[PDB]
Design a protein around this ligand. Sequence first.
Ligand SMILES: [Zn+2]
Ligand SMILES: [Zn+2]
Lengths: 172, 83, 103, 172, 69, 24, 45, 306, 332, 111, 43, 54
Amino acid sequence: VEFTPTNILSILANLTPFSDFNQSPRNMYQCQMGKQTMGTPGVALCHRSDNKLYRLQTGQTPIVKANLYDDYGMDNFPNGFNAVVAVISYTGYDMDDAMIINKSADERGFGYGTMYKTEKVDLALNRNRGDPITQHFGFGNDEWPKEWLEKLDEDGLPYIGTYVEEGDPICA
Amino acid sequence: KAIPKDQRATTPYMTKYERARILGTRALQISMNAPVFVDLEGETDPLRIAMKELAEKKIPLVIRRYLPDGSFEDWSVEELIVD
Amino acid sequence: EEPDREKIKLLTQATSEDGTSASFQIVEEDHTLGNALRYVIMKNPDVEFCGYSIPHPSENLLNIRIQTYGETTAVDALQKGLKDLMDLCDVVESKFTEKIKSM
Amino acid sequence: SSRHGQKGVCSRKWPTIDMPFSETGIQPDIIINPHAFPSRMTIGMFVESLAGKAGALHGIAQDSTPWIFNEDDTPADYFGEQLAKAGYNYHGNEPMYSGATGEELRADIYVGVVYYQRLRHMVNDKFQVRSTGPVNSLTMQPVKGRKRHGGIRVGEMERDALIGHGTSFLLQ
Amino acid sequence: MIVPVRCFSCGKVVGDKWESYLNLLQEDELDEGTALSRLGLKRYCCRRMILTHVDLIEKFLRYNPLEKR
Amino acid sequence: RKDVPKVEGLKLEHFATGYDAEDF
Amino acid sequence: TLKYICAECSSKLSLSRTDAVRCKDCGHRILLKARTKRLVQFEAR
Amino acid sequence: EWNVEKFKKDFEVNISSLDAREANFDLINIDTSIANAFRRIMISEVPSVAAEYVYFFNNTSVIQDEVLAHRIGLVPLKVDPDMLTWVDSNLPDDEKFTDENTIVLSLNVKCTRNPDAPKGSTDPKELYNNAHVYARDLKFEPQGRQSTTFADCPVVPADPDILLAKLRPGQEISLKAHCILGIGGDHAKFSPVSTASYRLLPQINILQPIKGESARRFQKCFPPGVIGIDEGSDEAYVKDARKDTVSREVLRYEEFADKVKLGRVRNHFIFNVESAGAMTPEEIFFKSVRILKNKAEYLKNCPITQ
Amino acid sequence: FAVKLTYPEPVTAYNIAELRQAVINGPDKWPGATQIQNEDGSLVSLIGMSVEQRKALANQLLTPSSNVSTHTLNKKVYRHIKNRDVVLMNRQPTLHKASMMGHKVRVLPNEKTLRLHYANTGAYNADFDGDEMNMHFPQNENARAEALNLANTDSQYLTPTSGSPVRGLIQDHISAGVWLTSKDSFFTREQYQQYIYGCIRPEDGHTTRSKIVTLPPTIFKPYPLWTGKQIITTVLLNVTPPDMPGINLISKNKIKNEYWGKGSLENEVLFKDGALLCGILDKSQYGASKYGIVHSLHEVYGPEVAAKVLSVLGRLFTNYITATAFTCGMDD
Amino acid sequence: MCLLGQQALEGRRVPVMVSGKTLPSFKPYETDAMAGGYVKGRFYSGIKPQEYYFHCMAGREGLIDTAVKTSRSGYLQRCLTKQLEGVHVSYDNSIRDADGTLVQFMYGGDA
Amino acid sequence: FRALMQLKYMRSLINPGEAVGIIASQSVGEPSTQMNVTLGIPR
Amino acid sequence: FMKMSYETTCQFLTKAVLDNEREQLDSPSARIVVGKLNNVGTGSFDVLAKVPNA
RNA sequence: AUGCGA
Ligand SMILES: [Zn+2]
Ligand SMILES: [Zn+2]
């Protein structure tokens, strides 16, 4: 006999509560959404440098969960939040596949998330040994617009924390 | 190629496609300083102006209906039943 | 200081000349003022029709149309609404203060 | 998306004043259209709503393991009785008032607590517009890609469709 | 990330009630329900706020690169 | 099969606005 | 004094155009640029 | 016929409970449009004072600057919002912030280690110094006039215990928040109430009487004290319909669903206004009704434009 | 997009005011204008000009001729897309010409997504699940006139495949029509008139009367009461031209009469001189695109009226779903 | 509200292993309707795991048909759309191609 | 009435220049996406 | 050009060149290739103008 | 080209 019929399900399919109550392809689209979900990728993110990360700051533990949610420790990396949901057509913008959020809730940080993009500024990406080298982060001619110091420190690297908009210098 | 006026045999009605092209080309003319033959009555959209010009049939345009042979019928706006 | 020239606007497209049918447009309003104002306006025995409509939530606009018969003007009927809302809110504040004091 | 593969875009950020408020004094976080469920049969989501509501009120997690329940021990009865002991409708509805007007709605509205997840695909941000940009030298036609400020393709089928319309001046 | 300041659904400030709540689950050997009842979170929007919280910042903070280790 | 057990602390957690367990 | 922290020893330092890009206290070759007292405005939303 | 004085005759208020943070009061004989007007205004339009522009000078914490700024925005301040006027936008930043329109709060915290606790984690508060950054660490920084004006109303967070951030040795937070006057409609941080809601008085119309153990058995179907039985040999009565929650649990049983009707009193409204501490809830209601009246005066005064 | 999409508008004596203002606004406003193309052929970008310089150019949009080479032309202004332009919307599937129609542009504030009415989603086979759409902006009065006259949505109310209507209300609007049109739905004068102005704005050109007209209540008695069918009568009486008799139709519903009782009769949809006298309305009626009510209005008064009816119904049912809402739950 | 009913694949009942079993839990050649894939359980009260494996079968094969139908309709569209694109209505109501070669003397014979 | 129906017939005719070829192709293709002898798309 | 733009482009090209073929530029596809008003619909006809001579 | 969104 099976130890538990969950032994026939994959990990994500067990993470789906009451998966035996939905039309099967909706559970499969659930695996694709939860698998495509913006969540907490790790906690060493200050020591990675991914081309992109999506990190939800307001993460919570489901009230409704599989016991494999604890047994696999997925609570270390919560991927969502518990919301007060009314199943109601009322506003007229909830048709077919569109849903409404509370404005005040988003203003309080609901589902607030951040996205990290990492860049490599290389000066040899395609150099040519000793000879080639000559570029140094910094300045020399003075003739540059001194407003670049508004973004780049006197060593040629931007001040960590700086607000940057397209067009601002990322290094000099 | 000239189908004699006495011999024009085509639909007395303006097709939706005919009406569309007339209104577009004439509107474009008004927008390029073609002389307006009707009161602008406040309007600023050249297309609505050309629509007014169609409503009074003041438009000075002619439709050349082609036949696949190559013969054609020159029809005035002022005769083709607008709608 | 200036009499606000843009708060309320009279939509010529929606106003009779005889004198008893207008649509007014107020900026920066919604059901908040709207449904109360139409409610008090419906108390006017000389209002035939009155109601409010939001052209679009994102636009932050309120249109309120009052069409009456020849025994009142829509501007007058609206002023009757506003005097009723002000006096009624005075009543609410007054009884609320009285019961706050009675405690 | 919910844990049920029922994904939807946020159509609008509804003002809290305009949301519907329950007689409990709250207005939902999310409103989902009911007509989405009849095709999907995501009734696991209904049970997750009533279980998250019971489990928030009594203040405990609920087990959602597939087949922990039985046709003779339905979840609507388990969480129905637990919720009714809590002080809430056995069917899980709550009397709601219209935010806009203020009357009580016709019927008791289905409200609950559901784990909702934010998909990384904010395709909202993927918008692009090009009225001017670079062109490939071998064609002088708009370059490719959003990040290249490229221009969307009018494909062969869209050509066919424009010929269908008779819109030959639009096709040109 | 860190205990939210306010309950998304209602509006009641909750960020002050985390540490006492955790103390009430440790020190007083209370249960989560009764602890939230004594905290005044008498609505499920509030109930869930603290009940479901996952204070992942404690896991984040051990990665502090500004002190030797 | 055993039915999943109902919770032991299954007691009122909701009141009207205006009221408390001082009436319970 | 500009600052650069060693990715592996935590030791603060102040690189110059005249020194090797290495942690002088450990020997690492990766340095995090330290945050400083620099004004940034923020809309509280 | 309807007049405003016949309303004044018909309008009633009954205040059940007035706490310095919650008010539960009733408005009898009003229109839903008016109760909803007061509710809506109490929520979105009543001005409150909240942090708006946070100026960081340093943040080495593991918390994102933006996020911490939003969290500092969320902190409700115990400030009477009438001490300040609105700040315009038509004018330069140098004129925007003055002592008449802005309140400055400084935060300068530096986390250290403590000289050697007992075991180890002996929490965080003993292993580290200023490990926990609370709203109570928002030092109020007055300017001139308002320095004197607040002599007897200094600026304090309405809940100092709010944890704002957690640090680690060598991490530091230095920022200066500019708190302005704003309304809850422009952003939810300016809403002065936690929950302002109304509920219609539940009405329990008993169509035929029930008695004995079926009457007490009906009595246990409702919240404890809604249905009272004095003798039950003659009636099963309603002690107070206001205690009920409309769980509609009674309808589950045929013993009753054919001998009871459950409705509401359209005229009677049960308001519940709980304040976030910035202001007392009744004072917030007073401001809401005076706000609606002020709006009607604005519409009287305005000239109908064309 | 409203600030990043332009039309090359030749300046005349009739549009000098609007284009002078649009230039004054500049590229960084509403109906301003990003660029000015002279008749000499040169381009002058407003990307970085100051309000002063754009003010200076506003007084030069109407300058005289200068070269016999150019005397026949007039300057051009690249104005932002605005509320008077038509745009060609296409959704991938192109599978048919009806999936790429011309819509009239309505710039919505504080939006980031292309906003579309529900009535079109059964022609594009589109759904807000995450669907993306291409928006094409034609640059020529010939393409404008065609996108407003040939490709336009109203000219696509029926498919050529079968001639069944592909454009109708959906989901919630259908259940709202089913609920509103029940003989059980009554409305007070206040409620009735409110729903009416909620769905009809005479200031918006939503009528053929320039005032409002109303019916007698269904119940004169204890209280003046209007039915939902009387509301559909009022909207149809207000959207059809006063010079024409009311549409007369005998249709059917998708709801058997047995569901409304042992003697109830609610499947016969009866329209007499503009007045709904029996039955409810559903997908079979204004969405079914098979003779139902909307199809009948399309046939009798044409596509402009049928489109007006669709917008009016969409607003009526959305607002009534605001008053009463619709829900579904485990008890169901 | 009632039952899921009989699952099917490519037009017929559940696949059976070469041992004669439609699932490990079923003895070889089980004549029970359920063993063929008939699910008596419903979404409101759930489906037994043996039944979840069959509704999963039908749901997947549905997703396959859904993902393949669009590749068989593009070539059906373009293959004749290339041919009839020249095909239009002459001004004489006769259907001529853009060449001029007459295809029909009237559209459907009624115009 | 017969005169009216004849005039409706004259006013219901296909316009000169209609893209009926393309319309045909889409009216056979587009509905074939919803899809003893060969049936459906293979047929 | 309609042959060229479907399949075996080079094969139809070869058979065309070997014929010394002339395109009468009627195919809508072919006409698109040369940047010509499509002959269908609104391009099924020409528009001229009546102008006063005095 | 791989994966993937619709
Ligand atoms: Zn809450
Ligand atoms: Zn080191």
